[PDB]
Amino acid sequence: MKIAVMTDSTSYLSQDLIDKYNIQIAPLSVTFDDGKNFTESNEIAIEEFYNKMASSQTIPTTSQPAIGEWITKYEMLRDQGYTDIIVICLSSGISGSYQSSYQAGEMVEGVNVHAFDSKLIAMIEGCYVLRAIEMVEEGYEPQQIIDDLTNMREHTGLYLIVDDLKNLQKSGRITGAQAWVGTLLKMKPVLKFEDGKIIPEEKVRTKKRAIQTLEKKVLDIVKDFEEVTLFVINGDHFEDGQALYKKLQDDCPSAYQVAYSEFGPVVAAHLGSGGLGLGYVGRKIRLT
Ligand SMILES: CCCCCCCCCCCCCCCC(=O)O
């Protein structure tokens, strides 16, 4: 038995872990109305993408990995000699990448494809990849791995702050007067992941109080977990994410694993400039 673990680009794992464990990546894409297409990888400049998103009158569209990259990746893993492939995808409720990976897993002969719906995104999704790899190293069975990941999904979440009301207007989700009143009142919508769906939670004035609410809610949730791993997922606003990270380091005991990360173009295209998330998992994920 030879078990491998792969994922998509929305897991936003650092290139270090991808090189160390040789994790395969099915990249997503983001295309603008001008024809400019960005394929998610650790080589493109996120600053250029943010500058484009600012210099674009219309919001871009996002694209799941085409029903092809999964096929070649499974084929290469089978040619290398792998009996089982555990695939970790972003939330199937927000994207079709999980469905495309599952469908591609049916057209590849010679290896079992275990597609997993992480119901999350970013490093919170990459935590499933890290746990799967760790438990392959421990000598677990793919069914036991899927069971463990499903149990982990029960104690895993992500809260989010949207800062770009102009981006929400550019997508048509809000009106002009709404955006103006939100800017005047410093209104910052707070959202959360629930069963793979992004649902509203609070509407907090100013980004500072919204960050405090993020911390309060996540700490209240993880107080009951035997193991806690927190993740700051920042955007182009370095100061906000760094402040939240340092506040967590000061407020949380060392028994908590606090980490920092940043999301890429596919997430930024829908979150806008200044978005910031706090995610949690109820396990001690091996981040090295
Ligand atoms: C850590 C930040 C989380 C914010 C995530 C916001 C993105 C919502 C949906 C993701 C992109 C849409 C679907 C991906 C590509 C596609 O299938 O079209």
Side-chain angles (χ1 to χ4, degrees), residues 28 62-64 90 94-96 121-122 158 160 193 198 233 263 266-267 270-271:
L28 283 92
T62 46
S63 299
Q64 74 212 262
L90 69 155
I94 83 183
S95 168
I121 191 96
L158 168 73
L160 291 158
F193 269 74
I198 311 186
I233 319 179
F263 37 61
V266 161
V267 159
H270 285 130
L271 201 63

Short mmCIF file of all heavy atoms in Angstrom, two decimals, residues 28 62-64 90 94-96 121-122 158 160 193 198 233 263 266-267 270-271, ligand 1:
data_model
loop_
_atom_site.label_atom_id
_atom_site.label_comp_id
_atom_site.label_asym_id
_atom_site.label_seq_id
_atom_site.Cartn_x
_atom_site.Cartn_y
_atom_site.Cartn_z
N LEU A 28 -6.31 26.61 -9.21
CA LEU A 28 -7.49 27.33 -9.65
C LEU A 28 -7.06 28.55 -10.46
O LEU A 28 -5.87 28.83 -10.62
CB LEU A 28 -8.36 27.72 -8.46
CG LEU A 28 -9.20 26.60 -7.84
CD1 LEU A 28 -8.44 25.93 -6.70
CD2 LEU A 28 -10.55 27.10 -7.36
N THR A 62 -13.85 33.47 -11.06
CA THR A 62 -12.98 32.41 -10.59
C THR A 62 -13.32 31.10 -11.28
O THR A 62 -14.48 30.86 -11.65
CB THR A 62 -13.09 32.24 -9.07
OG1 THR A 62 -14.47 32.24 -8.69
CG2 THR A 62 -12.38 33.38 -8.36
N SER A 63 -12.31 30.26 -11.46
CA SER A 63 -12.45 29.02 -12.21
C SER A 63 -11.83 27.87 -11.42
O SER A 63 -10.67 27.97 -10.99
CB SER A 63 -11.80 29.13 -13.59
OG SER A 63 -12.42 30.14 -14.36
N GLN A 64 -12.60 26.80 -11.24
CA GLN A 64 -12.11 25.58 -10.64
C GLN A 64 -11.03 24.95 -11.52
O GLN A 64 -10.93 25.29 -12.71
CB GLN A 64 -13.26 24.59 -10.43
CG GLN A 64 -13.73 23.94 -11.73
CD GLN A 64 -15.21 23.63 -11.73
OE1 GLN A 64 -15.62 22.50 -11.46
NE2 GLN A 64 -16.02 24.63 -12.04
N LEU A 90 -11.22 22.56 -1.55
CA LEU A 90 -11.95 23.60 -0.84
C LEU A 90 -13.44 23.23 -0.78
O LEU A 90 -13.88 22.22 -1.33
CB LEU A 90 -11.75 24.95 -1.52
CG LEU A 90 -12.37 25.19 -2.90
CD1 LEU A 90 -12.60 26.67 -3.12
CD2 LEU A 90 -11.50 24.62 -4.00
N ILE A 94 -18.96 26.27 -2.14
CA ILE A 94 -18.52 27.53 -2.72
C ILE A 94 -17.85 27.35 -4.07
O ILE A 94 -17.73 28.33 -4.82
CB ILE A 94 -17.58 28.28 -1.75
CG1 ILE A 94 -16.14 27.76 -1.87
CG2 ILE A 94 -18.07 28.17 -0.32
CD1 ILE A 94 -15.18 28.41 -0.90
N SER A 95 -17.44 26.14 -4.43
CA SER A 95 -16.72 25.91 -5.67
C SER A 95 -17.02 24.50 -6.16
O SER A 95 -17.48 23.64 -5.41
CB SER A 95 -15.21 26.12 -5.49
OG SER A 95 -14.49 25.65 -6.61
N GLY A 96 -16.75 24.28 -7.45
CA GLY A 96 -16.92 22.98 -8.06
C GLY A 96 -15.66 22.15 -8.13
O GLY A 96 -15.64 21.14 -8.85
N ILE A 121 -11.22 26.56 3.50
CA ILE A 121 -10.41 27.25 2.51
C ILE A 121 -9.11 27.66 3.19
O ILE A 121 -9.00 27.65 4.42
CB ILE A 121 -11.18 28.48 1.96
CG1 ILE A 121 -10.48 29.08 0.74
CG2 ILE A 121 -11.36 29.51 3.04
CD1 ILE A 121 -11.02 28.60 -0.58
N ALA A 122 -8.10 27.99 2.38
CA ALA A 122 -6.84 28.58 2.84
C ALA A 122 -6.12 27.56 3.72
O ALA A 122 -6.28 26.35 3.55
CB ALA A 122 -7.11 29.92 3.50
N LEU A 158 -13.94 28.99 10.39
CA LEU A 158 -13.24 30.18 9.91
C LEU A 158 -14.20 31.37 9.91
O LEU A 158 -15.24 31.33 9.24
CB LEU A 158 -12.69 29.95 8.50
CG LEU A 158 -12.20 31.19 7.76
CD1 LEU A 158 -10.89 31.69 8.36
CD2 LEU A 158 -12.04 30.89 6.29
N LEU A 160 -14.49 35.65 9.20
CA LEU A 160 -13.93 36.52 8.17
C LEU A 160 -14.47 37.94 8.31
O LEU A 160 -15.62 38.16 8.69
CB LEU A 160 -14.26 36.02 6.77
CG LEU A 160 -13.56 34.73 6.34
CD1 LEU A 160 -14.33 34.06 5.22
CD2 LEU A 160 -12.14 35.04 5.93
N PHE A 193 -17.84 30.49 8.18
CA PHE A 193 -18.08 29.25 7.45
C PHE A 193 -18.96 28.34 8.30
O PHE A 193 -18.73 28.17 9.50
CB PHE A 193 -16.76 28.56 7.12
CG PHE A 193 -16.20 28.95 5.78
CD1 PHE A 193 -15.60 30.19 5.60
CD2 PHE A 193 -16.26 28.08 4.70
CE1 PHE A 193 -15.08 30.55 4.38
CE2 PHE A 193 -15.74 28.44 3.47
CZ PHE A 193 -15.15 29.68 3.31
N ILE A 198 -20.69 30.25 3.27
CA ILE A 198 -20.33 31.52 3.88
C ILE A 198 -21.63 32.22 4.27
O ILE A 198 -22.43 32.59 3.41
CB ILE A 198 -19.50 32.38 2.92
CG1 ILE A 198 -18.35 31.56 2.34
CG2 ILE A 198 -18.95 33.61 3.65
CD1 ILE A 198 -17.39 32.37 1.49
N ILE A 233 -5.31 34.58 8.73
CA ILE A 233 -5.24 34.56 7.27
C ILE A 233 -5.46 35.99 6.80
O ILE A 233 -6.59 36.49 6.76
CB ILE A 233 -6.27 33.60 6.66
CG1 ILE A 233 -6.34 32.32 7.49
CG2 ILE A 233 -5.90 33.27 5.24
CD1 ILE A 233 -7.35 31.32 6.99
N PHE A 263 -3.95 34.60 2.11
CA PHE A 263 -4.66 33.95 1.02
C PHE A 263 -4.23 34.53 -0.32
O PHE A 263 -3.58 35.58 -0.40
CB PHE A 263 -6.17 34.06 1.21
CG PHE A 263 -6.62 35.36 1.79
CD1 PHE A 263 -6.36 36.55 1.14
CD2 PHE A 263 -7.29 35.39 3.00
CE1 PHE A 263 -6.78 37.75 1.68
CE2 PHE A 263 -7.70 36.59 3.55
CZ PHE A 263 -7.45 37.77 2.89
N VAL A 266 -7.54 33.83 -5.78
CA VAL A 266 -8.91 33.36 -5.89
C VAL A 266 -9.74 33.84 -4.70
O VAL A 266 -10.90 34.25 -4.85
CB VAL A 266 -8.94 31.82 -6.02
CG1 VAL A 266 -10.32 31.28 -5.66
CG2 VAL A 266 -8.57 31.41 -7.44
N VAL A 267 -9.15 33.82 -3.50
CA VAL A 267 -9.86 34.31 -2.32
C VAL A 267 -9.98 35.84 -2.36
O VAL A 267 -11.04 36.40 -2.05
CB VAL A 267 -9.16 33.84 -1.04
CG1 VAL A 267 -9.55 34.73 0.13
CG2 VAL A 267 -9.48 32.38 -0.75
N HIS A 270 -12.86 37.64 -4.35
CA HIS A 270 -14.18 37.71 -3.75
C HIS A 270 -14.20 38.42 -2.41
O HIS A 270 -15.24 38.94 -2.01
CB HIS A 270 -14.76 36.30 -3.58
CG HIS A 270 -15.23 35.69 -4.87
ND1 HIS A 270 -14.86 34.42 -5.27
CD2 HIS A 270 -16.03 36.17 -5.84
CE1 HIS A 270 -15.42 34.15 -6.44
NE2 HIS A 270 -16.13 35.20 -6.81
N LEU A 271 -13.07 38.46 -1.70
CA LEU A 271 -13.01 39.12 -0.41
C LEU A 271 -12.70 40.61 -0.53
O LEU A 271 -13.08 41.39 0.35
CB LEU A 271 -11.98 38.43 0.48
CG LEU A 271 -12.10 38.63 1.99
CD1 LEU A 271 -13.40 38.05 2.49
CD2 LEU A 271 -10.93 37.96 2.68
C1 LIG B 1 -9.49 32.71 4.14
C2 LIG B 1 -10.42 33.60 3.35
C3 LIG B 1 -11.73 32.96 2.97
C4 LIG B 1 -12.55 33.74 1.97
C5 LIG B 1 -13.08 32.91 0.83
C6 LIG B 1 -13.91 33.68 -0.16
C7 LIG B 1 -14.11 32.97 -1.46
C8 LIG B 1 -15.47 32.38 -1.65
C9 LIG B 1 -15.51 31.35 -2.75
C10 LIG B 1 -14.15 31.00 -3.29
C11 LIG B 1 -13.99 31.30 -4.75
C12 LIG B 1 -15.17 30.86 -5.58
C13 LIG B 1 -15.01 29.48 -6.13
C14 LIG B 1 -13.58 29.12 -6.48
C15 LIG B 1 -13.38 28.97 -7.94
C16 LIG B 1 -14.62 28.49 -8.66
O1 LIG B 1 -14.97 27.30 -8.51
O2 LIG B 1 -15.25 29.31 -9.37
#
